[PDB]
Amino acid sequence: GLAVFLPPYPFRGLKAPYLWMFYKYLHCATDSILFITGEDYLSVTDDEAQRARWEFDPASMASLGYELPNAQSMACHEYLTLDNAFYETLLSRHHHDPIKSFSAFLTERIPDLETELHALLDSKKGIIDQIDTFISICNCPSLEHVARTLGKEVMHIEIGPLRAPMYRNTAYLDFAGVNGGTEASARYEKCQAEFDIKASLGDLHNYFLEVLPPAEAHSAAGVVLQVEDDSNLIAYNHDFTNISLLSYVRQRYEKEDILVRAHPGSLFRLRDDVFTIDDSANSLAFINQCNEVFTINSSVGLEAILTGKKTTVLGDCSYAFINELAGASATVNAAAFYLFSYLVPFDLVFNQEYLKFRLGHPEEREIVGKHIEFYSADMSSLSSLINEAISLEHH
Amino acid sequence: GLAVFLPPYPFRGLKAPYLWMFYKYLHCATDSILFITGEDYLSVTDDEAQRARWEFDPASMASLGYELPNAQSMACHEYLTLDNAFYETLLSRHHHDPIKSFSAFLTERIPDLETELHALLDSKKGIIDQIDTFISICNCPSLEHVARTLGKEVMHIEIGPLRAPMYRNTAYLDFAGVNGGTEASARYEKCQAEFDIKASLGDLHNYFLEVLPPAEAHSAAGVVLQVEDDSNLIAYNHDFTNISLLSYVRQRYEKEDILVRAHPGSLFRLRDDVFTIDDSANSLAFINQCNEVFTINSSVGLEAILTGKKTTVLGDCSYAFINELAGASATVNAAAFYLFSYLVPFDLVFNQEYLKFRLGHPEEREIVGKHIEFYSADMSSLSSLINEAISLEHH
Ligand SMILES: CC(=O)N[C@@H]1[C@@H](O[C@@H]2O[C@@H](C)[C@H](O)[C@@H](O)[C@H]2O)[C@H](O)[C@@H](CO)O[C@H]1O
Ligand SMILES: CC(=O)N[C@@H]1[C@@H](O[C@@H]2O[C@@H](C)[C@H](O)[C@@H](O)[C@H]2O)[C@H](O)[C@@H](CO)O[C@H]1O
Ligand SMILES: CC(=O)N[C@@H]1[C@@H](O[C@@H]2O[C@@H](C)[C@H](O)[C@@H](O)[C@H]2O)[C@H](O)[C@@H](CO)O[C@H]1O
Ligand SMILES: CC(=O)N[C@@H]1[C@@H](O[C@@H]2O[C@@H](C)[C@H](O)[C@@H](O)[C@H]2O)[C@H](O)[C@@H](CO)O[C@H]1O
Ligand SMILES: Nc1ccn([C@@H]2O[C@H](COP(=O)(O)O)[C@@H](O)[C@H]2O)c(=O)n1
Ligand SMILES: Nc1ccn([C@@H]2O[C@H](COP(=O)(O)O)[C@@H](O)[C@H]2O)c(=O)n1
Ligand SMILES: COc1ccc(C(=O)NCCCCCCCCO)cc1
Ligand SMILES: COc1ccc(C(=O)NCCCCCCCCO)cc1
Ligand code: NA
Ligand code: NA
Ligand code: NA
Ligand code: NA
């Protein structure tokens, strides 16, 4: 079965931080799952003091495709709960900086957490044998060390950079790292010579578009801001922040030529009069107003690259290698590989059979074939598969 | 004469960043000054592309007490200008992160900058002999190393934590460091036994108040936010940011009990619905609504301490040592020493005679006497001097 790691540590100030993925795995479960999580994930549903969070919003349940679980649903799974007291110990070991504690969680081993993971997995005979893989929503060297000792793989799984409603929902599935330390570039490198994609970047973008474009845009410099305590801005950012990203652009452009777009999930917005503030209904309308795009490691950086905009990417992320190729032809091929083979149809990362498939580490051809089958469920070599999928969308 | 260091490096995206202090020294000059600055400080006045900045606002000129300079004014001083090309070199040595370059400027030696400072000071015979002290608006180990080689002191001088209109204007004057690495605590330690202040913290606060209080406030937890690229949040912050400060408070309080106040000089404000946002006309009205106050190293932390609020100070700053004393009596004495001896009447740090005075390193008694003379210009031991000054305000 699956061992899904959903840590309860409230680094950013919210209990059950990964509640949406908990709900999605529960909803899609074909088999009994092993959850390694916190007490808070089980009780949050009967806690009216936070019934207003976004995971209970019907639009959120519709866009992500889950239902709130019930006793029947939950009852057929096993739960290992981490203890809240080690959290306070960890905070006190980092000057009580919860965000610096997050960073350490994401990027360093925590021997005490290893030891508690080992005891939880040991607490019931047979648990370890039934584990076919770990699944983790974030990098976590504590868990990766435990997994090595036990001979288990760790799938790092997250929502992807293309998301509804603008796009088909995508997910990350990476055996090395999600967002930071990813294997997307290394998987492409072993395939770069087995590529001949007869489509432009626009076509790749069009394939995932679920909406009509805004179209027909100007502002020399677009600045993408991110959520300030996103793991992306905590560990994978090369020390850049929204404020230093903004200064970086001002080293290059006069204020009149800068268009700034705050992240809609952020607790902060821009002061209304100093730079021009973007008011677009979506990040695609925002980048269409822009000649150049500047980001640390936002999902929007990928959007800009696919629509052909000169993009500056200051942080580490899964898609950066596409931007670092020099040839236009290589850039198209890399983007196609990223979109059709690295990225996963969102629902499939919660599908047990699909996960078993990937655990066998099959050929790139097979992975692309499975993804296109999903994408096409209502409408050969690797190149041949993607060219036909695109062609079928064309008419 | 004075050698005033006003670096031109636009780390935060503005040319002539320290233009206000340039104007204030020019306005108050009784003698010819040596300015070590950038070309931009001289030409900014004839540049209409930024006539809208705050240093040209009449309210700003009135509150700080300077006039815009003219040819006569400027003409009797000497100017050493730093070259813009080393700036680009420095940025490229820090991954083109302007804020990380700022940090390095504030906290590490830059041999190439030492070498250029040495050449500028050498470029005209006699310059070095006429230097009685350096004045710097920020810590700068490049300049401190040069100063040691030449046998010159470095006065670190800044606007203080109490400012008009709420307060009499104050300034910092510190031979070791301003904001970070300060000597306020060490100066108090040599005097702690020569103290007997017969006033409360409220009286000390009242002495500097220039306004009627808002009065009569509740919200358990006040969170003071700062400007995101303030040197205080770049180098002296112990890695804390507004976002991690906010999370720190959420580890301790429910969202309902949190009152957040954004800095009015910030480019960012808070999202309108998640925490309660302070709308006070001034930081004093904001902290009066609060049972506890949380800051990294804002000037407001001092305000909270003087009004008796439980204050948490997560970063380094000049006033923190006051908060770390355990006795109420010691806390009062430390605050009195800080306010009357460490802090300086704003105008005096631009007064050449006063600076010559401090360069002689006189007794704490003498420093307090001079400050009270200034404060009293229109109305003994060290304790005796402050008790009488307070008493005279009383009636
Ligand atoms: C209406 C629709 O198709 N919505 C998408 C979700 O699909 C629905 O919910 C899942 C649970 C079913 O398996 C599908 O057959 C479908 O009925 C989907 O889960 C999410 C994620 O891609 O996207 C919605 O748009
Ligand atoms: C499904 C989704 O994208 N949700 C968004 C949130 O991101 C998810 O939840 C947090 C807990 C994780 O750290 C993210 O990595 C991701 O898995 C996001 O935090 C909020 C606010 O921007 O918006 C949701 O839509
Ligand atoms: C009106 C007033 O006193 N304003 C204060 C400033 O003082 C004035 O300007 C200076 C240049 C003169 O030397 C003073 O005699 C006075 O006329 C003062 O400079 C600033 C700073 O403390 O504060 C104003 O409130
Ligand atoms: C005189 C004053 O307090 N001005 C405020 C600005 O601070 C000063 O200017 C910058 C360039 C320095 O880095 C500060 O250390 C200080 O000397 C401040 O930046 C702006 C915005 O908050 O507000 C002015 O009033
Ligand atoms: N400045 C920003 C950043 C993100 N976004 C939206 O948020 C989603 C996730 O972006 P991040 O990866 O930047 O969190 C993007 O696909 C885009 O829809 C936005 O609309 N404006
Ligand atoms: N959150 C904040 C921070 C500062 N301030 C004001 O800004 C001035 C300087 O504060 P900092 O030292 O925090 O920059 C303070 O004296 C106070 O008047 C405010 O009004 N609200
Ligand atoms: C306040 O406005 C300003 C702000 C900064 C400058 C300034 O010195 N630029 C020089 C370096 C610019 C970096 C370009 C690197 C190119 C590789 O990408 C001028 C004016
Ligand atoms: C989402 O709400 C939350 C957020 C965090 C917690 C939580 O685990 N607190 C435990 C540590 C709190 C730190 C106090 C240290 C005391 C020294 O100052 C609970 C609920
Ligand atoms: Na499409
Ligand atoms: Na490229
Ligand atoms: Na007063
Ligand atoms: Na104290």
Author numbering:
A (entry chain A), B (entry chain A): 1 to 217, 220 to 381, 390 to 405
The authors write:
WbbB, a lipopolysaccharide O-antigen synthesis enzyme from Raoultella terrigena, contains an N-terminal glycosyltransferase domain with a highly modified architecture that adds a terminal β-Kdo (3-deoxy-d-manno-oct-2-ulosonic acid) residue to the O-antigen saccharide, with retention of stereochemistry. WbbB’s two C-terminal GT domains produce a polymer with a [4)-α-Rhap-(1→3)-β-GlcpNAc-(1→] repeat unit, while the N-terminal domain of the protein contains a GT99 retaining β-Kdo transferase, referred to here as WbbBGT99. Kdo addition blocks further polymerization while creating the epitope recognized by the carbohydrate-binding module of the cognate ABC transporter, allowing export prior to ligation to lipid A-core in the periplasm. The evidence presented above strongly argues that WbbBGT99 is a retaining glycosyltransferase that uses a double-displacement mechanism analogous to that used by retaining glycoside hydrolases.
We determined the structure (at 2.3 Å resolution) of the wild-type enzyme co-crystallized with 5 mM of both CMP and a disaccharide acceptor (α-Rha-(1→3)-β-GlcNAc-C8-methoxybenzamide, 2). Disaccharide density is clearly visible in both active sites, and after building refines with good occupancy (0.9/0.8 and 0.8/0.7 for Rha/GlcNAc in the A and B chains, respectively). The ADP values are similar to those of both the surrounding amino acids and to the Wilson B-factor, indicating that the ligand is well-ordered within its binding site. The acceptor binds to the opposite side of the pocket from Kdo, making interactions exclusively with residues from the N-terminal α/β domain. Glu158 was previously identified as a residue being absolutely required for the reaction, and makes a pair of close hydrogen bonds (both 2.6 Å) to the O3 and O4 hydroxyl groups of rhamnose. Other important hydrogen bonding interactions include O2 to the indole nitrogen of Trp20 and O4 to Arg12, as well as to a structural water molecule. The GlcNAc residue is stacked on Trp54, with the methyl of the acetyl group stacking on Trp20. The amide nitrogen of the GlcNAc points to the indole ring of Trp54, making a strong interaction with the π electrons. Both Trp20 and Trp54 are important for turnover, with Trp54Ala having a larger effect, consistent with its extensive van der Waals contacts with the GlcNAc acceptor residue. The methyl group of the acetyl moiety sits in a well-defined non-polar pocket, with van der Waals contacts with Trp20, Trp54, Leu64, and Ile159.
